[PDB]
Structure formats: C-alpha cells, structure tokens
C-alpha cells in the first residue's frame, strides 16, 4: 500500500506507472504486466526507458506543460519513437499504435515517424563551453586550431548540405570558412569579457586564466560561469551563494509541471531561508532554491518533487565545487561558507541545526537519547562501544551497517604545520609552508556514505589560510588523502608588513563538523 | 522653557525621586527613581514601591513601567 | 424604511443617518461631509439617552461628530 493511490486504480484493471517509485512496487507492477494479469497500464513520459512489452500503444496528449517557457511544448519525436518503441509481444505479425494529436502537429509526426529523422547539429549553442574546454587542454593555442577542431566535427560536415539551417547564405568553400571564423571570434569575444582566456600578438597565442580552467575541469557551461562571476563578490552570504547556485543553465532539464508553482509557494512557509526579491517565481531557479532546502531540513516531499530533487543533486556537486573554488580564485574568506554549504549538500543537514542528524538514518525521537549522554560532536560516537550503540539505535540491520560504515571512514584528523622560517618573513614573497595532516584510520576506499544523497562520492579535503577581520584568503589546496599521514606545501604570497593573526582550517568537502583549526601569529617585514 | 524630550535626558543625568500614578486604580501609586532614555514614554524605574495613597506599607521590587500606563512623573 | 443597495460613503452623502456611540446614546442627522476617521458632520443632531427600557431626546447640536467613539451609522430616510 505504498503509495496508497496505486491501489484503487490498479484494483479494477488499470495500472499506474511514474518515475521515482519504491522499486519493489515498480517490480510488482512489471510482473503484473508480464504475467498477463493487468490489461492496461498508464505510463508517464519520463518512464519510456522502462520498456514494458505491450501490444497496442496508446499515446494520449502530445503536448507537455513545462514552466521554463510557461506553455505546452509538444512531444519531441525521439520520445514518441522510444514509446513505439515496443513491438507486439503476444499477437504475432502485428503492430498497433494510437497517437492522440493536434492538427498543427499532425504533419510533424505523420512524416518523421514513418520517414527517417533528419539529424542536425546543436553545437552552435554550446560552442562557448566546448571551446573553453579545448583551450584549457591547450590543443588550441590560436584561431586556426579552433577551425581545425570544428572541421573534425558534425557541425562542419552537416553545414555543407544544409547551410540555411545554421545561417549561411554563401554556400561555398570560402564563405562557409569565413562564417566559421566569425563564429569562432564571437565565441572568443564573450570569453574575454569574463576572466576565461587571454589573447596577445607575437601565430598568435591563446591561454586560460583561473576561471576558464575550473569550468573546464567541472564540465559547467559558459553562461552559468558568467552568472556566477557577476553575482559572487567579497563578503557574500550563504543564502546568496545558494541563490547563485540555483541560477544556472544546468537546470533546463528539470520539468515544472502544471500546478507546481502553487505547490512551491505553499511549501515556502516551512523553509529556513527566503528567495531574493529581484528574480522570477515561475522559473526553474526558484524551484531549485526551494528543493535544495527541502532536504537540508528533512521534509515530507511528494513523489513528483523527489525526482526533481534527484535531478538537482545530479548537477550540483560540480556547481558547488565551482562556487567554492571561484571564491578561492577571487581570494575572499567567504570560501568557508561555500565549503560548509558543499558539506551540507553532500550530506543533507544544516551547520548550526544539529551535527548528530548527519549520521545515516537519524531522527528527532532518537536524538533525545543521544543528548542524554552529552554527545555534542560526531567524534564522541567513535569512542562509544557496542552496548551503548544498541541501546541508542533499535532499527533494522542494513541501516546499522551503514551507520557503522559512516563512523569508520569518517576519520579523526589532526592539524599540524611546519613553517620554513618564522624569523625571516619578507613581504610579497612566495613563502612555502609544509602542513603535515593525519588520519585516525587509513582508508580501504574513500567512499562517502549518505542516505539523502543517493549518488556515490569519493571523499576530499580543503586546506585553507586566511585572515578573519579582513576576509582575504592567502593559501588554498584540495587534496585526496589516501594515505594515513602526508605533507602538503602551500606556496602562498605573504601579506603586507607588521603583525598578521593567520588561521588555518582543515574543512572536508563531504562531512560536517570536521573543521579542525589552528590560529597563529607572524610578523612580516 | 523645558521640552519633554530633553526632560528625559535631565532625568537620566540627575537620578531624582519619583511618585508615578496609574490609570485603573487611583489608590495604588508607584514610587521610585527613573533611569532610561527612550523615544516613547516607556522608561525604566529602579527600586519601585507601590503604596496605597488616601482618597500603609506595601513593598515591591524593580520595574520597567509601560509607555501607555504612566499618569504622572515628578522632578 | 427606504434605503437602496448603496456601495460606499461617497454615494450615500447628504442622507439622514442614525449614528450610534460607544456608551449607547443614539443620534440622528443628515451626513454632510466625509473624512479619514468618519468625522461625519451631522446637519441636525438630536441625541437620545437610554439609562443603565425607554429612549429620551435632546436638541443642542448641529454637529461635527468625532470618529473615535462611533459604532455604526444607520440610514433613516432620504431627503427631498
């Protein structure tokens, strides 16, 4: 009986099917189709991948509502193909398909399903990202390498036969080339406005800066990067960061259905943070903002929104990384906030709310019994023994196992540094500082454990150095701590003359409340 | 001429004895010393003592009296 | 009593209105003017008392009424 709405329809010979079910239920449904029990099955558009072998395929409504453009966009032909799609299993030498349609979309579907699909390029849209990536690799170091790259692509071998689709009126070996060149130039000259690449005369050199490189690394689009750049500045808040994260081109494939905006609005009463004043409500950004908070606070989402959340989570880990590391590049100490946010995302809990909720499968009923033994941090759970653990948690075995795993791979780490020369401190010199980190246990594998983040993650860290009053970061480095104890060398530029009360952090990218710190003073000349 | 906004300042400065009057009951009247500076009539009064005055010895602690319910001040 | 389906205070200007006060003294008078607080200028005020059974009468004022203590204004009978 989970969900209960599947019961009453399915009881009279008409099954239900949508995305993000309890797997067991789905399996049962499938069985009931295969076995010959359920005659009819109602299926959503997202579950065309779940190929249940039917005979007569009905396709009801070729017009899907999406809240990106706030209108009924038609069924793309690929989806239709996928749906039919399913050859006749029971009835041999036969095939039946009913497609319920508009008059406007009749000639569109009547031709491109019976006759082949003319395949064309959409590279002209995403060239900015791709080009940037190429530049970062450094196979492109000029405005002819790009051309060469293009020539080894579908765009260039599709534009010959069908030039009018992409906007080329000449249709010749020269004209086409010229057009391509122009396009390349255009692509470049949006990159140069932002902090992506640099071009100078001596054939002529092209190379990346800090912003391009990060983008290249994480597979994020140009537009998104630009957006991030424009909003993110010094002394920005967590809310602001969240907003920035939400505003991106990666969330164009997160469907806002009919009667979703209202739902979102309703939800907004039971969230910690609020949305900024000078943006839109119907757009996907708002939804993203809402749904990110919907699992920091462990709320009771509908099964439509679960899918959306999952989709968001698919995208965010790169985006959040970018956010944290763009601020680092810029050189501001609100990177800590970003790091914290990232941790939350990885796990699914706030920084101030509760450290004990972090552990897989914890709730407010059992947290009263955890506060009984004066447990504040998660490192106190490592020192506990089995008898007390049993008393605490009275749940199923898998959950317990998961918890144990979490406890184990979550390392107790120590922060110890070793400076080259505390006496000889010169201003504006690349002063190296060897930091010698440590773990409690050496890892078998670096696998991060979290219930509300389904996709798997490998654990990483972030070494930091920055002044608290100024909010100006000096030294940063990401590390993959696979050994038990290592040393790492931050080659950083020393600050201006006089005293500077510097503070190191050892913030993890995954686990909250592992912010080991050690403040110290230096006098620079 | 003494404006009532500068009067507050004066009160704060000197720390004078007071006999505050209430709205509802006529008999029970407070006695103490005003301390606070505020844009409203809301002012804090350390060592408050509510005495029944004729139309007697009833002690009391320390009060911040509400801005609406202050019928009299004296200094 | 004749009084139509009237919308607002502006459409019911210059009408003989009963007016009621906080303590329970009933008035009558033609509504001359409007204001923010409904300080409704009565053309001729005949105040009436009911002791704490039967209603009395007075005739001192042709008044500018004040809003604070008014309960609700009732129409009596149209002019002309």
């Amino acid at each position: 009986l989970t969900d209960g709405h599947l019961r009453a329809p399915l009881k009279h010979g008409v099954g239900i099917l949508y995305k993000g079910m309890a797997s067991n239920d789905e399996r049962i449904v499938k069985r009931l189709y295969e076995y010959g029990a359920v005659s009819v099955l109602l299926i959503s558009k997202d579950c065309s991948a779940f190929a249940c072998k039917t005979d007569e395929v009905i396709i009801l409504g070729t017009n899907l509502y999406d809240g990106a453009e706030h209108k009924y966009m038609p069924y793309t032909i690929n989806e239709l193909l996928e749906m039919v799609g399913l050859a006749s299993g029971n009835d041999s030498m036969a095939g039946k398909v009913l497609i319920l349609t508009s008059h406007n979309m009749k000639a569109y579907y009547k031709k491109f399903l019976i006759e082949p699909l003319p395949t064309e390029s959409y590279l002209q849209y995403i060239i900015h990202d791709t080009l940037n990536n190429e530049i970062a690799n450094s196979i492109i170091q000029s405005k002819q390498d790009c051309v060469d790259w293009f020539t080894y692509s579908y765009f260039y071998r599709r534009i010959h036969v069908n030039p009018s689709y992409y906007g080329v009126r000449d249709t010749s070996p020269h004209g086409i080339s010229v057009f391509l060149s122009n396009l390349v130039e255009t692509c470049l000259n949006d990159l140069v406005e932002s902090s992506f690449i640099e071009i100078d005369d001596t054939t002529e050199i092209i190379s990346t800066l800090s912003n391009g490189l990060i983008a290249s690394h994480y597979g994020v689009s140009f537009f998104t990067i630009q957006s991030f750049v424009s909003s993110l500045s010094n002394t920005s808040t967590l809310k602001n960061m969240l907003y920035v994260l939400s505003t991106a081109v990666e969330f164009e494939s997160v469907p806002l259905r009919k009667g979703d905006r209202a739902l979102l609005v309703k939800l907004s009463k039971r969230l910690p943070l609020r949305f900024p004043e000078h943006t839109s409500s119907g757009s996907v950004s708002f939804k993203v903002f809402l749904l990110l908070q919907a699992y920091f606070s462990r709320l009771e989402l509908p099964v439509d929104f679960q899918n959306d959340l999952k989709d968001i989570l698919e995208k965010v880990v790169p985006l959040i990384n970018v956010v944290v590391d763009i601020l680092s590049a810029n050189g501001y100490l609100n990177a800590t906030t970003a790091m914290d946010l990232a941790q939350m995302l990885i796990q699914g809990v706030w920084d101030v709310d509760n450290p004990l909720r972090q552990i897989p499968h914890f709730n407010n009923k059992i947290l009263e019994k955890c506060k009984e033994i004066n447990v504040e941090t998660v490192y106190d759970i490592m020192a506990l023994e089995d008898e007390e653990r049993d008393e605490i948690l009275t749940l199923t075995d898998s959950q317990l196992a998961q918890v144990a795993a979490f406890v184990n791979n979550y390392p107790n780490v120590e922060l110890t540094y070793s400076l080259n020369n505390s006496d000889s401190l010169i201003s504006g010199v690349k002063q190296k500082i060897t930091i010698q980190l440590t773990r409690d246990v050496e890892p078998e594998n670096l696998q991060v454990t979290s219930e509300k983040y389904p996709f798997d993650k490998l654990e990483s860290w972030w070494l930091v150095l920055g002044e608290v009053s100024k909010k100006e970061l000096y030294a940063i480095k990401k590390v993959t701590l696979n050994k038990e104890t290592q040393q790492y060398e931050l080659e950083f530029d020393t600050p201006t003359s006089g005293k500077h009360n510097l503070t190191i952090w050892c913030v993890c990218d995954s686990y909250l409340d592992a912010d080991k710190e050690l403040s110290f003073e230096i006098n620079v000349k | 001429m003494v404006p009532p906004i500068n009067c507050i300042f004066n009160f704060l400065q000197q720390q004078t004895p007071v006999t505050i009057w209430l709205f509802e009951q006529i008999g029970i009247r407070i006695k103490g010393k005003i301390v606070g500076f505020d844009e409203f009539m809301n002012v804090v009064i350390d060592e408050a003592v509510e005495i029944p005055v004729n139309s007697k010895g009833t002690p009391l602690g320390k009060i911040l009296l509400k801005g609406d319910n202050i019928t009299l001040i004296t200094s | 009593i004749q009084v139509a389906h009237s919308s607002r205070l502006a459409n019911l200007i210059d009408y003989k209105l009963r007016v009621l006060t906080q303590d329970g003294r009933v008035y009558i008078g033609q509504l001359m003017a409007f204001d923010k607080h409904m300080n409704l200028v009565l053309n001729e005020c005949i105040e009436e008392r009911v002791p704490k059974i039967k209603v009395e009468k007075r005739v001192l004022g042709l008044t500018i009424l004040r809003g604070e203590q008014i309960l609700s204004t009732v129409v009596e009978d149209k002019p002309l």
Binding site: H70, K71, P118, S164 | - | -
Partner: protein, 309 residues
C-alpha cells in the same frame, strides 16, 4: 456545429467567400447569411436608409430596395455606434448585434480553415470591430474603460498613425502630442497597458520539403486583470509573400506569466512542389490580437539565399 450556422448559410459562405474577396464583399456575404432571409426594407425605414447610404463608409454594390444592402448599412451603423429614433431600424440592428459577432467569427474561422490571406485579416478586423464597437480609424484608446472622451476625439482628428503614439516614451511628450497637457501621464500609463510585441522570427529548413520556424515572441506590455482579462489570445498566421494564402496558423495564449520574458515558439511547415523548386524572398508571420485593435504585428520571415539540401 459550433456557431449554429444553418446548412444553407454555410453553403452560401462556401462559394461566396473567395481567395480575392475584399472588405466590400465581406459585408455583402454577411448580409446574404440565411438568418437575414426574413429581413425586409420598409417605407418608414426608407428615409433613414437614404440618409445613411450617401455618407456610408463601406460602399454598397446593391441598392436601397434590396434588403441585403439595408442589413449591411445597419451593420456599419452598429460598428460606428448609432442608436436610432426610428426604432424599426433599431429593432433590426438589435438582432444584428446579438448575432453579427457570431456570424462574422464563423466566417473568419472558415476562411482560416480554407487558408486564405486577403479575407482572414480583414475578417479578423471585422470580428474585432463587432466585439468592441468601433472602426480601425477610431483609435484603440476607445476600448479602454478609463480613457476620456475629449482625448479620443483629439486622437481621431489629429491625423496620425496609431503606432507612433505607442512608440512615444516620455509622458510629457505624450501629453504634448494629444493637444492636451492634462491626462498625458494617464495616456502613457494606458499605452504601456496596450499590447506591444518586439517580435522576431528565424526560419530554418530541416530537410528539402519540411521547414522549421523558430519564432521569438517578446511581450513588452504591462498586465491588468480589469482591462485585459484572464489571458491574451494572439492568433499567429504564417502567410505567403503576397498575403494571398495562409501557410500555417495557430492560436497562442499570452498569460500574465509570459508578458516580458523571451518566449520562443517553434513550428514546422511542408512546402508545395513549385515552391520547393523556386522559393520566395520572405514569408510573412503575423500576430494579431482577437480583442485589441491595431495590434496586428506582422514581420518578414527571411528567405535570402536559403538554399535547401
């Protein structure tokens, strides 16, 4: 079925409507509608009719003795807002009022179905007029409930293209241009409350026969639930270079959420054989409002060097 048109009427519509049928003919066609078979000219109606048909804007192919002509003139009167003394005429006109907008609408629909370009735009205009009771040459400031009378008269009498007013930015300037410095601000406010679409459209061929049309429909106007209503239907017509025949059409609803966003609209069209062989300089995409007068924004869908595969 929809419009409760008699079969005879439908038949009449079928033949009498044509590819090259003009404003004059539309009226005639309307008159011919079989719901006016029981209508007849009368002697006490006659002087009024005579008076009319001299100063009538839409001319009359038929003459005073014919009932069709009379009907047409009544229609015109209705459009122009003419209440009457001789109420026989007025009674007739009441009938027209109750059923004109219907019949006209039906005709328009039929035209659309057929795919004819000369009638459909004119027909649409006629329908609009019927709906809100005014001409094209009467400004669309009349259909606003709040816009004053003096202003409208001035607008009518100044002899200016309507779109110019819309274009004007500053309220002071607007005030100056109306021959009335008062109410200028109000006018400005209501001009931003009139539909204004910065439309663009990029066509592109998928293959030889089929042609994709990526439309970019922006909506610059500011909403009002009183004046505009629930939503704004804007009937999109893709029509040929001449404006002779319709290629493809679709009704689109501009909601309050859309007005301002960069709203894209995609569609496909299969071409003719001759057309496919040798292709035109540009088609015409045309967005017209079903309610708002003189919105009728039409743009050139470019075909300069669009060589098919």
């Amino acid at each position: 079925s929809s419009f409760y048109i008699n079969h005879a009427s439908m038949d009449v519509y079928n033949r009498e409507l044509d590819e090259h049928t003009t404003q004059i003919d539309l009226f005639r066609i309307f008159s011919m509608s079989e719901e006016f078979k029981y209508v007849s000219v009368r002697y006490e109606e006659k002087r009024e009719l005579k008076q009319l048909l001299e100063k009538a804007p839409i001319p009359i192919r038929e003459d005073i003795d014919d009932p069709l002509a009379k009907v047409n003139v009544l229609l015109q009167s209705y459009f122009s807002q003419l209440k009457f003394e001789g109420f026989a005429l007025n009674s007739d006109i009441v009938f027209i009022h109750q059923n004109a907008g219907r019949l006209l609408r039906a005709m328009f629909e039929i035209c659309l179905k057929r795919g004819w370009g000369h009638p459909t735009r004119m027909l649409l205009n006629l329908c609009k007029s019927a709906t809100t009771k005014m001409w094209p040459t009467n400004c669309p400031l009349r259909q606003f409930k709040t816009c004053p009378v003096e202003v409208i008269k001035r607008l009518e009498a100044s002899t200016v293209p309507w779109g110019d007013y819309l274009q004007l930015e500053t309220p002071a300037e607007v005030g100056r241009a109306i021959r009335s410095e008062k109410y200028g601000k109000q006018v400005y406010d209501l001009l931003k409350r009139f539909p204004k679409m910065s439309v663009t459209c990029n066509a592109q061929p998928i293959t030889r026969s089929v042609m994709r049309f990526n439309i970019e429909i922006i909506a610059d106007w500011i909403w009002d639930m009183n004046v505009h209503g629930s939503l704004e239907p804007f009937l999109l017509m893709l029509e040929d270079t001449d404006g002779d025949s319709i290629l493809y059409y679709d009704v689109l609803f501009i909601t309050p959420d859309i007005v301002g966003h960069e709203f894209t609209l995609s569609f496909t069209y299969e071409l003719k054989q001759h057309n496919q062989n040798n292709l035109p300089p540009n088609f015409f995409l045309t967005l017209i409002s079903e309610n708002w007068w003189h919105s009728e924004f039409e743009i050139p869908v470019s075909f300069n060097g669009f060589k098919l595969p």
